[PDB]
């Protein structure tokens, strides 16, 4: 659970999920897990993706996370009617636009990095792809 400590507000709007991504380039690392679909990555999944990737590479390499939740999403207590005020925050989600890179790797061969991202994709709700770091 990657929560931003000491924030400004406590509960915000759900809003929309429009347009393409911004952080689309493959930075720092040699590899990257790019987003294809349009979804909502929760903090628990993100934790699960990092867990299910360090097992493949086994402690070697550098793991960059090109994303962060920072969106307090609330839920209502079950068995209570509508209204009465907006619910209590339960979990944090990261809004995902198509084309956003999620994880980047370096210090790993093209073989082992590739299957590492194969396990990470199985823990996430959004459909993804795999891209290399291109020069210029």
């Amino acid at each position: 659970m990657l929560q931003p400590k000491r924030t400004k507000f406590r509960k915000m709007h759900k809003g929309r999920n429009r347009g393409l991504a911004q952080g689309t380039d493959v930075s720092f690392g040699s590899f990257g897990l790019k987003a294809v679909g349009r979804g909502r990555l929760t903090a628990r999944q993100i934790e699960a993706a990092r867990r299910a990737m360090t097992r493949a590479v086994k402690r070697q390499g550098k793991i960059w996370i090109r994303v962060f939740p920072d969106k307090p999403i609330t839920e209502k207590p079950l068995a209570v009617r509508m209204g009465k005020g907006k619910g209590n925050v339960e979990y944090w989600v990261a809004l995902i636009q198509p084309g956003k890179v999620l994880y980047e790797m370096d210090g790993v061969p093209e073989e082992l990095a590739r299957e590492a991202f194969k396990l990470a994709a199985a823990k996430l709700p959004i459909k993804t792809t795999f891209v290399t770091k291109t020069v210029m």
């Binding site: 393409l20 991504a21 689309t24 987003a35 294809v36 198509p98 084309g99 291109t134 210029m136």
Partner: protein, 94 residues
């Protein structure tokens, strides 16, 4: 040595660029000196496998336009959001 063919466009817009990118050919631009920033339209497929080579972004390219040869230099490449496709290339007329 890295020569490729090109063609000038007739329409410059969102209606134009989207319409031509669907028929496998993408827009580009070249600029240098005090001439006109030429609106370049070239083939899509060939350039994709051409930019896969890293030497593409170092050597002075030799594109052609209506018989004339102009030696340019690739400066900026505007890739696609999530697809292995190309959108816009900014050459500098060297």
């Amino acid at each position: 040595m890295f020569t490729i063919n090109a063609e000038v466009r007739k329409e410059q817009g969102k209606g134009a660029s989207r319409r031509l990118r669907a028929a496998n050919k993408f827009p580009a631009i070249i600029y240098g000196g005090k001439e006109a920033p030429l609106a370049i339209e070239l083939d899509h497929d060939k350039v994709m496998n051409m930019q896969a080579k890293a030497e593409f972004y170092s050597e002075v390219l030799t594109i052609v336009v209506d018989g004339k040869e102009i030696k340019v230099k690739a400066q900026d490449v505007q890739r696609h959001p999530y697809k292995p496709k190309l959108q816009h290339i900014d050459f500098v007329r060297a």
